[PDB]
């Protein structure tokens, strides 16, 4: 189990970003926030749902009531640029985290991503096996979220998706990959992959 | 103050076990619970154990049965054993202390830099290659399945194809093998005229693959 986090937050230097940490009665717990940047120790920006290290920039607030903590940056600086992460206590698993929430602060425009899905080939087939495949390129900033359909319902076995690569020209890339058996494949009338990128949502679709 | 450090092998087979450790500076070994924690992709940010200098321990449930964690504060270091490892445990380990207290209030406050552990194929294998069939353009390709180690080469039409052509970076599989796709863009106009064909060649492996990608 886990708290509820947007996948990604993006802002223009200098403008708010508020990243919420949803859970069943959290406001009654004391959330405390992680900021972790690759290659280097995580920090503490918040504890006690409001409380600032020292050390901590005064931009970084946090707020906790009801099912939501909110982490608020205010004037987000380039130097924000990380992952963030919920945490508060759980009466089973000791300690319980968000789902964490990639803030970019923007570097460039922003760019939708170019989305194409392969079905299996004949010759994977006939080897039994089946794989398809979403590839997903030229999109800013780098963070996606993508959903495999089945028909219409929700795909939860078989999918592999890379984390976001920049790309030569700055942009970003990923792939996702959905194995299935061969019978699955010609089960269904169709698959689509779902990708998300901030706000919009394109679905590429393919059939037996 | 009291800074962290992680030291990890780096790179690990699948079934193996996983041994870190971190090494302690500044202050003592005291008023601290040691911890072990992982980020991932899949995982998220997962606690995985702590540890009281008194030998005192808990992990996660979840991992219980393949943790040990231990401490010896003649040597300010602690450690983590992860059993029966497999691509899933693939992940930035990170060290950290946690302060005595209600575990209601309970942070992880210091951490070290984190490790990054790859857990992969206890062996090499080359690639299967399929082909990936087909404004006025089309994007057709070939995919790139279960090899192991990095690196592969695509080209295609032996290099003299190359514009329209993206290669995109593998994905690590839980089967501990890599996977990736090379596609290119090319006009509609083409298709039953033109041929394309990719060359796919992975040297560990000391193999070479050529597919011709048609539409049906
Ligand atoms: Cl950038």
């Known amino acids: 189990y886990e708290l509820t986090q947007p996948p990604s937050v993006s802002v223009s230097p200098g403008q708010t970003a508020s990243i919420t940490c949803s859970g069943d009665k959290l406001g009654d717990k004391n959330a405390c926030w992680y900021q972790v940047k690759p290659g280097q120790s995580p920090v503490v920006v918040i504890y006690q749902d409001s409380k600032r290290p020292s050390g901590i920039p005064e931009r970084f607030s946090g707020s906790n009531s009801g099912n939501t903590a909110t982490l608020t940056i205010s004037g987000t600086q380039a130097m924000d640029e990380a992952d963030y992460y919920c945490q508060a206590w759980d009466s089973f698993s000791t300690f319980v985290f968000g789902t964490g929430t990639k803030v970019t602060v923007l570097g460039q425009p922003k760019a939708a991503p170019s989305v194409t899905l392969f079905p299996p080939s004949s010759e994977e087939l006939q080897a039994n096996k089946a794989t398809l495949v979403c590839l997903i390129s030229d999109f800013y900033p780098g963070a996606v979220t993508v959903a495999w359909k089945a028909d219409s319902s929700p795909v939860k076995a078989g999918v592999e998706t890379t984390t976001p690569s920049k790309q030569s020209n700055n942009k970003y890339a990923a792939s996702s990959y959905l194995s299935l058996t061969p019978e699955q494949w010609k089960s269904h009338r169709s698959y689509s992959c779902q990708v998300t990128h901030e706000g919009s949502t394109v679905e590429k679709t393919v059939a037996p | 103050q009291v800074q962290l450090q992680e030291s990890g092998p780096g790179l690990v087979k699948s079934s193996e076990t996983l041994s870190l450790t971190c090494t302690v500076s500044?202050?003592?070994?005291?008023?601290?619970?040691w911890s072990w924690l992982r980020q991932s992709p899949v995982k998220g940010l997962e606690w995985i154990g702590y540890?009281?200098?008194?030998?005192?321990?808990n992990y996660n449930p979840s991992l219980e049965s393949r943790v040990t964690v231990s401490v010896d504060t003649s040597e300010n270091q602690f450690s983590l054993r992860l059993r029966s490892v497999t691509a899933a445990d693939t992940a930035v380990y990170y060290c950290?202390?946690?302060?005595?207290?209600?575990?209601?209030?309970?942070?992880?406050?210091?951490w070290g830099q984190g490790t990054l552990v790859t857990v992969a194929s206890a062996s090499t294998k080359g690639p299967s290659v399929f082909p990936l069939a087909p404004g006025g353009t089309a994007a057709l390709g070939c995919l790139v399945k279960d090899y192991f180690p990095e690196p592969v080469t695509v080209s295609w039409n032996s290099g003299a194809l190359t514009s329209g052509v993206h290669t995109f970076p593998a994905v690590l599989q839980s089967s501990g093998l890599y996977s990736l796709s090379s596609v290119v863009t090319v006009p509609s106009s083409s298709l039953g005229t033109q041929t394309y064909i990719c060359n796919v060649n992975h040297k560990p492996s000391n193999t070479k693959v050529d597919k011709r990608v048609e539409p049906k």
């Open positions: 950290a202390s946690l302060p005595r207290g209600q575990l209601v209030n309970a942070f992880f406050d210091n």
């Open positions: 500044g202050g003592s070994m005291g008023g601290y619970y």
């Open positions: 540890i009281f200098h008194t030998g005192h321990t």
